[PDB]
UniProtKB/Swiss-Prot annotation:
GO CC list: membrane
This protein's name: Haloalkane dehalogenase
Pathway per the UniProt entry: Xenobiotic degradation; haloalkane degradation
EC top class, as a word: hydrolase
Keyword Hydrolase set for record: yes
Subunit structure as annotated in this protein's UniProt entry: Monomer.
Domain named AB hydrolase-1: residues: 32-156
SUPFAM superfamilies from the UniProt entry: alpha/beta-Hydrolases (SSF53474)
Keywords: Detoxification, Hydrolase
Pfam family, one: Abhydrolase_1
Amino acid sequence: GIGTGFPFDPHYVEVLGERMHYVDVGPRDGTPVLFLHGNPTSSYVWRNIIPHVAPTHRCIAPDLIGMGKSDKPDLGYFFDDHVRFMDAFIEALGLEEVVLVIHDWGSALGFHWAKRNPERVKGIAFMEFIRPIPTWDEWPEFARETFQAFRTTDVGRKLIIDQNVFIEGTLWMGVVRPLTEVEMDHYREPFLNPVDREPLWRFPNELPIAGEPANIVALVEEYMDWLHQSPVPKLLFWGTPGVLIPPAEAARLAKSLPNCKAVDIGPGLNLLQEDNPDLIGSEIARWLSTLEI
Ligand SMILES: [Cl-]
């Protein structure tokens, strides 16, 4: 079935006095493809997509600061912290122009960086991405009560940090097919020390839902305005029923984003990579061949 192994040699780079881990495969010459995961995942989420792209393009997949095999300093892990570390990661590797492949909070990082560096982004492939959720009615019903509890300090931290609910419960609820024990262990590994679960709690508290927190809402609105104006080639993957991007929203985006190709992956929730990695990787690989790179 879907591959469970992580057959990538570790690479580390110094970023702002810490070290970040990243996958780095594929040819050295050309435009690199930068894969950005979100919550509560790591570069592991790209393990079955990267092999479709690596034959033709360099694939760089960092673990966000505090996650995967990256260092876990004593930060709050605000979106601003992820921005600072990812900006510095890209510069530390000397990347010039890139293609972005982005998901969940990795998509907020990717779109925010693209808005600020438009001349350096030659294409964006994205899925289940951060957009403003104007009211809780747009969040899926079965998951509203949980995310509302996550978005508190005392109850939410007890759930996410003390009891590891984002890993043990939410993650499994983000894939239609059942994650296997080996896959769960790969997702659990970075967070075996409860103190290291800080980013898993801060992330849902940063989600731009019903206008709060206002700083995140504004930043996400700004990159969405940029995206609808930009001629950058776009590739949107979507599934049914989705979580962040239900089918009706995917359809709205497909007709209103310039130069946008849209691919229905079939059944999918949030981690679309875990329900249909082969279609995602194969379509990205072919789409890269149509770009001016
Ligand atoms: Cl989240």
